[model samples]
Target: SQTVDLSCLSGTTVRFFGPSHHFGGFTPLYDPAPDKRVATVDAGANALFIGGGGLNGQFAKTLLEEAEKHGIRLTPEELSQHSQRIQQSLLRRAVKSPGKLVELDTGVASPVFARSFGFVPVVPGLMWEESEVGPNVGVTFVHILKPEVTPYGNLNNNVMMYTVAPSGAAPDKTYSLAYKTTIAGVIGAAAAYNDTPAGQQYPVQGLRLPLLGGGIFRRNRSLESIGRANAEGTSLAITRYGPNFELQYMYDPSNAALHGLQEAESTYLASAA
Candidate 1:
């Protein structure tokens, strides 16, 4: 059923689907035409946000080229590994202080990625709870874009990720994680918060915590630590670069019971909005 006319559609525009043709990976190589129309037959393929430029497309392109250069078809399994390695490489490049960039704590790839796509990076101030851990100690990079459809859905918000290191340490010494959230979830929460008479509208700040890994797209390459819970329901996770660093997952002074405090806390926070 792959047969189609070749010459009849020469002057007409066409979009393709299937493994045989590459739709330029997660991102496209060239900018999309203003009048472009795209349709995908694959459900998984539909999740990919289209028509933006970044290392995502270039990174994917690089992997495919490597496979072609070596005379082999790029398999799905190998593609995952290749993408992970490219992300690691790009992350390393971002951390090594490339070019005129002076800020080195939050890593480099994000800023460069923002600039390449005609956007700027916004570094938000840490909240009171976050600041109590250390004085101005967190390194975060935020890029706010015009509302667009994301894999999660047509989220009318931007993407966010951050890297947090200890009080006095290099950026490379800490663990960083990417955040993946839905537009509706984030916006609805904020909107509900603002509806209250005493509630102040809080601008969306990218993910600053690294407690869970449900949809974290990228993370520090050197994380090789174990996370566990205690009898009292307190979770202690250790991440290592040179020395062990501990992060507090959940701690409730009021609740002494250990069984389900973490889940309780998550639900409370979500409902609190």
Candidate 2:
């Protein structure tokens, strides 16, 4: 097992463009300008999006490999088909299934669809970090950013991936691990609304305020077949950790007057005996 020298990628940056299609559609919920999503990769293109359905294939391959490893016979083609089946099922459940509606914005008549997604460039940052799964085996987990430019773009239901180059693998490896973005959906939703319709509301327009919402990895497959294929626990973990230090200080305070006094004392103390 020989580690590939990735040090050369230290300063490299990858400009991520949005996928040509968003969940098989053209209209986007939030689409940022091309420049906004550009960021330094800190590593070379160790990852790439094979296509819209590459994620589905990757998950299916993992499951097939695991099953074969344990004496369950299966063919690559069969696994490939299975992946497609699961992806389609997941898609249907997200959009067409009853009760899939995530939010009913009664105030503005906006029906926030859980499965709705739009094309937007990837956010700038460590899109993937180098990691090791076993002895001499290295991989990087891809990061998915909810598009900041469009209202329909939420990282929760999006997908991305990076190739896994094990020891002795060629510089041009083909295998990859797909990952749904992990950031809390709150940040994503806030950005979407603040930049889109909500931010444009009259009489209160120009004031971009953040709101809270439950974070969920929307299209995750919880069924046994799909779950087994997820060797890396790719299932979306639905959790919430909010109103932390910054949010608490700025938006969660119970009394504005108290905050005003605290700010005054901290910034400028009055002359007193």
Candidate 3:
């Protein structure tokens, strides 16, 4: 069977501006005259938030071709029908677990930092506090010598994926797997939480920080769909034995909107674009 190369394009851009384009830049120029020159902090241009959904679609297309080669031949109509079924399964395909991370203001920073750094999730870290009870600190507080930055940095997460019939192929023929990439703090916290069923009930199972305002977990639903397509195609090929296994993985863009918020904030503080 021949190989199909997916030439996916992620949008990218660049812009130029002067000092007034950023927050620090607008800080009111004082005269010592500041010597007739201005400065620009090239924090970074906008990022084309690519989500993981596109990967799912690619998974489907590639699976179609490979199934045919493996003698699991099916027409396009059959494939479409199969995918419809697979979609139902997709809703349930997610790996669910009773995992939750709760921040403890132990009045000590060492332990907290150790915990948060551990999760090390692959993408879009969705960790938020249920309440801002304690003073949340970070680089923003460094100016005031506050240690809220905590050694853990930013950690808190939980998400898993399992693939069943990656290609939407014949029934009965399926593969199942699970993966969890959490931050260190969350991992330690999850371990203790999972010890008891009652401890796990609050957030409920399968709880992930909402993405796209409770839409997709990556960027947007559309971008997520694209990444899903890519995931579907790639997972099928890389499963068990396959060539160019390098093509087996792809990006998911479910959290583009959230990043957009962050990017906007960065742009505001940047040195005038």
Candidate 4:
């Protein structure tokens, strides 16, 4: 059997059969907006967006290694410098001082995930729909990437999990959760894609993907929180991660599982007969 084929609607949107129903003890990570439109612009093949929202010790490795692949070869110092700025911006808004000038409620520096990879931490003016405009939920800050043909298929667009905590290697649970918050934390980090402009169109119907930390590729060590991470780990490992940790499933917003499509041919031509 071969995998089912999916056609990108208009380069910026794709539709699933229905809304997320719930499978594997997790819901499909997506924005709860009505539009359900995700923007797709090839930033070019050499583009790389770095995300550092809920940074901490463990993710240190991820940030470093990935930086290398992209050639920035970001060292610990650079990583700290970059993330520290995030903490700085957070503190900036926290003190009721929203940027030195101009409305700074938006993401600190421009953002996105995967090749579109970006980072947006939840701080004062950043979260909540009040100070900020859109839903402004505190999300994990997914990094956008140029489309890649992972084992899943030639994904027109790709997104991956990423986050940062203030602490370097100390011990931060800003992301890890126990029970109830577990759901919140997981979804927040995976979804929350919150790109640049909010309400650019309306009802905010784009970017609600949470590259499940434990999807097929064991990302977000946040997986440490639940066993389902394990289930989802292998549950969707239908095959495995690619050399670059590619996706193994087609990943529908409603369904966490990918259905293998089979082809059928008329054994006997009824019309001709």
Which of the numbered candidates is closest to the native, going by highest TM-score?
Answer: 4
Compared with the true structure, what per-residue lDDT tens digits does model 2 show for residues 147-257? 321222423322222222221121212112222221222223223433444223311111111111100111232222222212111112112221111111112122221
Tens digit of per-residue lDDT, candidate 3, span 1-273: 112332221111111112343343321111122221121111110111111233233323433444455455545555445433332222222212222322222243320021211111111112322122011100000000012221111111111111211111111111111111121122233333334342333211211111111122222224433233333322232232122211111111333323332343354456375
Q: How displaced is residue 116 in candidate 2, in Å?
A: 18
Give candidates' CA RMSD values in order: 19.1, 21.5, 23.7, 15.6
Worst lDDT 10-window in candidate 3: 136-145
Q: Give the TM-score of candidate 1.
A: 0.21
lDDT of 1 at 85: 38
The alpha-carbon lDDT assigned to residue 61 of candidate 2 equals 42
TM-score winner between candidates 1 and 4:
4
- Assess each prediction's global lDDT (C-alpha) against the native: 0.24, 0.24, 0.23, 0.29
Please say which candidate is ahead in lDDT: 1 or 3: 1
Put down candidate 4 lDDT per residue, 51-79, tens digits, no spaces: 32322332444445544655554567665
